[PDB]
Amino acid sequence: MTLGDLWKRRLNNCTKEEFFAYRRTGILETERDKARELLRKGETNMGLAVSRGTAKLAWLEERGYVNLKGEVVDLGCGRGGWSYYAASRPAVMGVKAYTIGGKGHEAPKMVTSLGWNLIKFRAGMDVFTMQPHRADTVMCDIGESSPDAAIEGERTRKVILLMEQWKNRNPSASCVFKVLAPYRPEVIEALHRFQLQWGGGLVRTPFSRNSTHEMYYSTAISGNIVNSVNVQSRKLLARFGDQRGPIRVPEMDLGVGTRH
């Protein structure tokens, strides 16, 4: 059993008051007051982020931890926060975005965020059974939390396998993908094998809530996997009892318009 396995059990053992005090303490959170209601009322002329994912991918790129360029594929795009971010980047030429949609899952939000015309959204698509195709950059933000750590580990392993398939088709592709439960031994093993073939490493973004152990894998960085996960598990355990709240920051506004 890992330190992160312990963290998950301690999290599940929290009272509701302990859970509410823990989940957001010390984390960056974008101010979504205006974006949330523009999306609810169906406004489509807006460049404010459609989801909290946009700021996370922006942080990774600004840190230099991901390379977004060329033909981008967004696997499990949900509302599309990563697709709209990639579409606004000058080095990106097009985005093919796929997501399952349907009951309980998010469909793409349709807005005129800068470069929207370069995105081809396809909902109703299961990326785990879809044949890979050409891509310069492969992005995947898939991983639904579960109180059951074995389920989180299985969901994570499926994403790593998916990324191996896309790398087999595109050995030179830049990759960035969510690793929902890096604290599971079977995820660490699958990640180590990915690293030995393709390079890369793991990083925690400051927007992730303390109630999730999610980290992001990118071929553009390096680092011992076991050390990265353990450092993060210690940080998550250290925040139990912290009284500070979230740090509020402005939401990303990409502006509106086409790219040609």
Ligand X SMILES: Nc1ncnc2c1ncn2[C@@H]1O[C@H](CSCC[C@H](N)C(=O)O)[C@@H](O)[C@H]1O
Annotated binding-site residue? 8: yes
**Of the candidates 42, 90, 147, 250, which one interacts with ligand G3A according to CB under 6 A?**
147
Do 179 and 143 meet the contact criterion of CB atoms below 8 Å apart? Answer: yes
Residue 105 interface partner, choices ligand X, ligand G3A, none, CB cut-off 5-8 Å depending on type: ligand X
**Of the candidates 3, 67, 69, 146, which one interacts with ligand G3A according to CB under 6 A?**
146
Question: Does residue 212 bind ligand G3A (CB under 6 A)?
Answer: yes
Question: Does residue 79 bind ligand X (CB under 6 A)?
Answer: yes
Q: The dihedral of CA 252, 67, 88, 138: what is its sign? A: negative
Segment near ligand X (CB under 6 A); pick from 38-46, 65-73, 126-134, 146-154: 126-134
Q: Residue 211 or 230: which CB sits closer to ligand G3A? A: 211
**Of the candidates 12, 44, 45, 224, which one interacts with ligand G3A according to CB under 6 A?**
12
Residue 193's identity, in one-letter code, is R
Question: Does residue 99 bind ligand X (CB under 6 A)?
Answer: yes
* 15 contact partners, CB below 8 Å, separation of at least 6: none
Distance of CA 29 to the CA centre of its chain: 15
Do 73 and 138 meet the contact criterion of CB atoms below 8 Å apart? Answer: yes
Backbone dihedral angles phi then psi of residue 225, each to the nearest 5 degrees = -70, -50
Question: Does residue 80 bind ligand X (CB under 6 A)?
Answer: yes
Segment near ligand X (CB under 6 A); pick from 11-19, 34-42, 124-132, 190-198: 124-132
| Coil vs helix vs strand at 169 | helix
Element (H, E) at 120: strand 119-123
Residue 123 interface partner, choices ligand G3A, ligand X, none, CB cut-off 5-8 Å depending on type: none
Segment near ligand X (CB under 6 A); pick from 29-37, 95-103, 181-189, 247-255: 95-103
- First CA to last CA across the chain, in angstroms? 52
Do 178 and 158 meet the contact criterion of CB atoms below 8 Å apart? Answer: no
Name the DSSP class of 118. Answer: G
Annotated binding-site residue? 81: yes
**Contacting ligand X within 28-67 (CB under 6 A):** 51, 53-54
Do 26 and 220 meet the contact criterion of CB atoms below 8 Å apart? Answer: no
Element (H, E) at 225: helix 225-238
Q: Tell me how crowded residue 88 is: count the other CB atoms within 10 A of its CB.
A: 22
Give the residue ranges of the annotated binding site.
8, 11-12, 14, 16, 19, 23, 51, 81-82, 105-106, 126-127, 145, 209, 211
Site residues (CB under 6 A) for ligand G3A?
Answer: 11-12, 14, 16, 19, 145-147, 209, 211-212
Cite the annotated binding site for Mg(2+) by residue number.
145
Q: Contact residues for ligand X (CB under 6 A)?
A: 51, 53-54, 76-82, 98-100, 105-106, 125-128, 141-142
